[PDB]
Amino acid sequence: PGATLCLGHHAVPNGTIVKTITNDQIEVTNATELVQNSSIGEICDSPHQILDGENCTLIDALLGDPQCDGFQNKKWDLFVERSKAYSNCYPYDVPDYASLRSLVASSGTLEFNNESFNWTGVTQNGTSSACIRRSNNSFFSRLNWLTHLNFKYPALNVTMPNNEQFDKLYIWGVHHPGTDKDQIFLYAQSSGRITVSTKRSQQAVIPNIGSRPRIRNIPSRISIYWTIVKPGDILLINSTGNLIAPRGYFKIRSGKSSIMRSDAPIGKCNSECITPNGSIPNDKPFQNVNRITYGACPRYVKQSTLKLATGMRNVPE
């Protein structure tokens, strides 16, 4: 008689195939997916401070395009730029646009402080029909279009000390009229010139008169420049025409802010990891949703699936 005692292990009728060092397909009793492959399709408004640019790029909100007036002085962790965005002020370009966009994005604030520059000798607050605010000819909110006064434009030599304990970011520009006629009509002399300097920098710009392909019926252009001024340093502006003057400075901060291009709607929900496709759960270590991410995110990989065994080899009856 006696007895028999057998040792054994479980099995399941529904095993899962995983890869190992020695075999690309071996069945185990259970596994878990390590690649996040989906989003809910909306960017959750929590816990990061989201700023939806809507019709405005960050640069347009910075300069003060009238449709972006609602953005004044706002802060963000993540600024979201929409593909539908468009400019509706005076046509402009920014040499090294990507760098200005980046540094403002990273700073994470549009906080602006007005300053009383001395523009004695010229006419301030020039407006344009290409930049309508409240049904009237206007201009970028943060810029001051200077023109002749009584058919004179005296050589400007204007100073602004930074006596703060923080850096100042100045945004200014040069106007390129479309014709000599316009140059004279605005600035009362044939050729303008702009030099913006500090103790540690100098930016000299020569206006270029000439027609460009019209944008919203405008053949002229403004080129945008920027200058950072440290505490103890001084902004100096020298111009004999064509200066698009700053009205003050932006505060520049450091921290965790950024900018992302996405058309995903903002949702009332809470998610740490943002991608342009929408927020994604961050439980898994990897993800194949987007190489662009913000926040505590799984790492982007090329694989669509990676299954980690969480059970023994499955050996069915």
Binding site: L7, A11, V301
Partner: protein
Amino acid sequence: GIFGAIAGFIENGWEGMVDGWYGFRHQNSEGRGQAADLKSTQAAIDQINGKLNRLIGKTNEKFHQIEKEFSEVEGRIQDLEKYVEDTKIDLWSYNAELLVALENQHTIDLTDSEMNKLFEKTKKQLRENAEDMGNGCFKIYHKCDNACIGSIRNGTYDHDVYRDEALNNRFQI
């Protein structure tokens, strides 16, 4: 795989064992039965949970980075931005692929190990009273009722109690 129990000398698993990962089936004069072994089951589970603790819910925060999509052709700098990102992604994809292959081989081996440890522990417990049939089963050479089988499972079996009976049966002619 490396110990040779699971998918090895143990012919197959038991789909009917639903309350543990390892266990015992017996036949004696009172019937035939099955019982999960909790300690071996927990040892395997704890190790797998250790891997999971390293991998799940442990992501890294990143904020402002570089651009990764571009609307205009630019040449040298954009080539470099793209190459940096492509390089990064391939290295992470490699890490992820290797991690899964290594961990999975190891998970199969550690679960095989736990099966083997429980088998070896049982074998030693039985001393001279049973013989290894080569398929994970022991032929026990004495009357071993439910309480007796339970003592083996519970690690309280006293081999001396049965030794005379078992030796007489084993070394018979």
